[PDB]
Structures are given as structure tokens and as C-alpha cells.
Amino acid sequence: QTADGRVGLVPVNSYVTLETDDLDTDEHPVTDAGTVALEPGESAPIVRYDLGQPAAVYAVGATDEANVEYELKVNNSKTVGGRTNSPLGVLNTPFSFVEKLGGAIPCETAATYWAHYSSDATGTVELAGRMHIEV
Amino acid sequence: PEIGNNGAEKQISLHKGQPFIDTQDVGAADPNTPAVTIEGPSDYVIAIDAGTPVAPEFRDANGDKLDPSTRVTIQKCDKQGNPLGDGIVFSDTLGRFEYSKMRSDPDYMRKTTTSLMIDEREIVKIFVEVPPNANGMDADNSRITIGDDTSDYGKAVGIVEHGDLSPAESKA
Amino acid sequence: QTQEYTINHTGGVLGDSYVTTASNQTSPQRETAVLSFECPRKFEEINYVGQRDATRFVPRTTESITGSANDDTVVDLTANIQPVAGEEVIAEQDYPVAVAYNVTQGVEVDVVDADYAADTVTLGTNPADGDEVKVWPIMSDGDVQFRLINQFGQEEGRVYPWSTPLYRWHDFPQLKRGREINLHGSASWSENETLEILLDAPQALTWEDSDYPRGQYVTTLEQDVEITL
């Protein structure tokens, strides 16, 4: 009846959904199915967005463990949420920044969802995640 | 008796035996762990100029110096212990000080690179990168000093009470 | 934006992956590549300036002997030798010209003095017959230089044409402003591009031995650079 364009009409060919299989070959820890992390407590990355152009973070999700911390950082320095025991978001039900608050996290150069494995813990761990981005 | 109204911008220096500073032991290959933590006291403002001297004097538990390939990095942090890329200063190696004459000599006196400021509630950390198969740091014998009071050489750490000046909020 | 950091022959701001070390070659005198640093993914660019950025590079070599019944207390060498910035005395130097270690007696070995004219050095101890020894004397008679690589092993230029001798490098007292060393040239590069630090000298230098007392990594490099975040 009225206001067909009210929904927003996000720009097409400007929206991406990353996975673990798109990090690189360069970064050391990687497998075929999902990311791993060493026992002494390596800071294994799960998701990374490297691209010279800016972007915005609409959503994040990742697996969960018992003795692991996680964080998310816009450019290569700054973390937004310092640390967490029970992470935000999971697979098939991620954490929508736009839903839970107004706006989205901007990103100029690159973003990264790091995972810190606690040295107190022991044994190998497999991890994975997903992230929804718009330029 | 008579005392002069000294200026608010007081010239000071930092060391271990203070309340707003802390340290903790370190092992090997542990960059994320800060060996030393500093925090801004309440209603005060600290200022560290670019030509400020720096002086870590870490040790081993047995009373030895560590591998000079070891690295030291002073670094400013946002609140919640969160580091930052900008504002960092003094990414130096643990060698090439000659601790004997280090503070003594203006030559051995290694200064910072860029200016720095600490708002009332902020953090500055000192990360250390030791190569593996080496000895760990011992907090009983380690120490930091920065700034140079009490010498015509070097610079000093500025401090001011926030509640005195009106544009202190603007400067922060 | 811009900072002034130090970078080392291991890890540091890079992370031990985009460094690589290597030894030289002896019989064919050739401009080997002993070290190289590749700009990682995360940085924007790296700069490098002469007469602005300080430097340090302490190399050594390795040699061995065989214990004998006769009281040696002295060993010849295959490398030209001099003191650290010049002096006959030991323990006054900025660092020891030479280090020795006995395999059997897992202990350090002091040094008294040396001729410093021929390839000679004294030992203070009295090694036993059959005991294995290692020594890491100073190195001499070499040249050092820089070059850039555009991701492919494919040179485009050279920082500074004329090589500086490592001999002179040891001669100057290091780590003194005014007397600090500062090469020439103004280089800059970006992501995944490499700076190679190259060596031309006969004697076989080292990076790792796993039985050296004064630290794990024997030699070292420590260079100042400017980085754009």
C-alpha cells in the first residue's frame, strides 16, 4: 500500500559472510574442517577480515568452550569487548549488533576475532566462527 | 616558617614502591602478560614528555641479567587493560643499556620516542618478550624507573591535581 | 600514526614467521643473505632512514679444538681478530671479544688476553686431554649491506651502493649517541615486501648453538625503524 523502500534496501554486491576457510595459508594454525589451538595457550584466530577498503561489522558468532577466552578487535590494535568467558553468539543464532543496539561497529582496515586458550587448560581444541560484514 | 607556593606542575618520577603501580613475575615467551602495570590515581593527571628517560633494570631469580635479545615495550592502554597501537613508546631491547652507568650517564640514558599523557583512570603496561629456553623474571629484584628528577640532565614526569586547574578537563 | 620501534633477529613486532635467518658461505665468496624481514599483513608500510635510525649488529663465528696432554692455554684461529673497540684488557670491553665452553665440564671459560695481531687467543684454564671445546670468537674481514625484494625474490633496487665493513662496525663503540652508527639511504616498503640484510665474508658465522652461556641466540641484530601503525 505504502512505503515499499522502508525496509532499507541494503546495497547489493557489498555484503559478505566469512568463514574459517578464508583466513589464509600463511597463518600457522589451520585445518580442513575448523581452526585449532595449541596447548601452551596460543592466541588462535578464527575470523579475520583483511582488505584495504573500510567496512562495518553487522554480526559475529563463534563456538564456545570451557577454558577459553575470546575477543574482537577493529583495526590491528583496538579491542571492543576486552575479554569474555561465555562468548557472544553461536552458529545458526549469531549475535546481531544491529538488533541488540543501534548501529554497527565501523572498520577502516581490518577486523579480527581472536581466541585465547588458557595455559591452565590442557588438550587440543577445535573452534570455528562466522561473521557478517558490509563495506 | 615559610614555604613557597610551588607550581602545580610538579616534577616527579615513578618506581616500584608506590601504590598506583604493580608488578608480577614472568616466565618465558609471555608477551601478553604485563610484567609491570601502572594506573592513574584519582583526580590527578600525569604527563610524560617525549624526551623522558626510561630505565628498566630487570633481573633473573639467581641475580643475573637476562638474554639481551629480550625485548621490552612500554605501551599505553585504554581502560579494561586494553592495549592500543597509537600512543605506544619505547619498543626497545633489554640489552644495550649498561645498567651500571645507565641512569648515571646522559649518554646511556635512553629516552622515549613520542609524548604521552595519562588521564585520571588510564593504564600503561610494560610487556616483555623473552626467548624460550631462558630464565624467567623475578619481581623481587626487577625494577622500573622513568623520568629524571634531581639532575640537570634528563626530563621529569609532570603531575598535576585535576581539582586545581579549570582547563584540566579540556586538556584531558 | 607514526612510531619509532626496534626490530630484532627474532620475533619482536613481527612474530617469528616473517623473519628468516641463514648462514653465509665460505668457499665461494658470495654476497649471501644472512637475514631478512618481510613486512606482515597487518602493517601499512615500513620506512627506514639513515642518519636518523640507530643500529647494532654483534656477529661471531664458531670453532673447535681437541684436548691434548700438553698444557695448551692458547689457540690459533681462522679469523682475523681484534678487541672490542680496542683494548688489551678483558672485562672492560662493552662485551667479550670471545667466549669458550667445555663440553665435558659444562662451565664457562674465562679469557685472559690475546695478541690481537695474528689469529691468536689465550685461555685462562687448562683443558684436559680428549675434552671437547667450543669457542665463539669475534668475526672480522667482512662487508654488510641491504636490499629490497618485491614479494618474488626479484630485486628492484639497493639502499646504499657502497658496503660498510663489519670490521669497522666492531671498531666503533656502539650504543653512544653522537658516536652511534647511522648508515645512509632512505628506503620504504609495504605489505609482504622484504628487506634482506646481506653478508660478504669468508668466516662461517652463527645464529644458534644451544650450548652458548651468554644467552641462547649467539649473534644479534637490533635496528631502529619507523612504522605507520
C139, C165, C195: which is the final residue of a domain? C139
Torsion over CA of C133, C138, C144 and C148, rounded to 10 degrees?
50
Q: Does C41 touch chain A (CB under 8 A)?
A: yes
Tell me if C87 sits within 8 A of C94, measured CB to CB: no
Report the C-alpha dihedral over residues C84, C88, C92, C93, rounded to 10 degrees. 0
Which of helix, strand or coil describes residue A4? helix
Q: What is the C-alpha separation between B138 and B87, in angstroms, rounded?
A: 28
CA distance B99 to chain A (A): 32
Domain assignment of residue C131, given as a range: 60-139
Claim to verify: residue C134 and residue C224 sit in the same structural domain = no
Interface size, chain B vs chain C, as Cβ–Cβ contacts under 8 Å: 57
Q: Are residues C55 and C160 in the same domain?
A: yes
The span from the CA of C86 to the CA of C116, in Å, is: 9
On whether both C112 and C165 belong to a single domain, the answer is: no
Q: How far is CA A4 from CA A12, A14, C71, in A?
A: 17, 21, 99
Q: What distance in Å separates residue B28's CA from the closest CA in chain A?
A: 11
User: DSSP characters for C87-104?
Assistant: -S-SSSSSS-S--EEESS
Closest alpha carbon within chain A to B87:
A77
- Measured CA to CA, the distance from residue A60 to residue A133 in angstroms comes to 9
- Judge whether A120 is closer than 8 Å to chain B, CB to CB: no
Please tell me which chains touch B, using 3 or more CB pairs under 8 Å as the contact test.
A, C
Q: What is the DSSP string of C141-210?
A: S-EEEEEEE-SSS-EEE-S-SSPEEHHHHHHS--S-TTTS-----EEEE-TT-EEEEEEE-SS-B-SB-S
Q: Cβ(C119)–Cβ(C80) under 8 Å?
A: yes
Q: Which of C139, C160, C187 is the last residue of a domain?
A: C139
The tally of domains found in chain C comes to 2
Domain residues of chain A, as ranges?
14-135
Q: Which domain holds residue B88?
A: 1-172
Contact C9 B88 (CB under 8 A): no
Q: Are residues C107 and C166 both part of a single domain? A: no
Count how many domains chain B has: 1
Residue of C nearest to B97 (CA): C175
- Picking from B32, B81, B86, the nearest residue to A82 by CB comes out as B81
Q: Of A43, A77, A82, which has the smallest distance from its Cβ to B84's Cβ?
A: A77
Residue C207 vs residues A112, B41, C210, C211: alpha-carbon distances, Å: 34, 45, 10, 12
| Grid cell digits, residue B168 | 584540566
Say if residue C129 is in the same domain as residue C89.
yes
**Residue in chain C nearest B114 by alpha carbon:** C3
Apex CA A100: angle with CA A99 and CA A105, to 5°?
85
| The three grid cell numbers given for residue C103, joined into one nine-digit string | 663440553
CA angle C174–C180–C183, rounded 5-degree value: 110
Nearest-Cα distance to chain C for B120, in Å, is: 24
- The technique is cryo-EM
3-state secondary structure A68-109: EEEEEECCCCCEEECCCCCCCCECCECEEHHHHCCCCEEECC
Of C139, C160, C175, the last residue of a domain is C139
Neighbours of B98 (CB within 10 A): 13
C216/B67 CB distance under 8 A: yes
Residues C50, C160 contacting (CB under 8 angstroms): yes
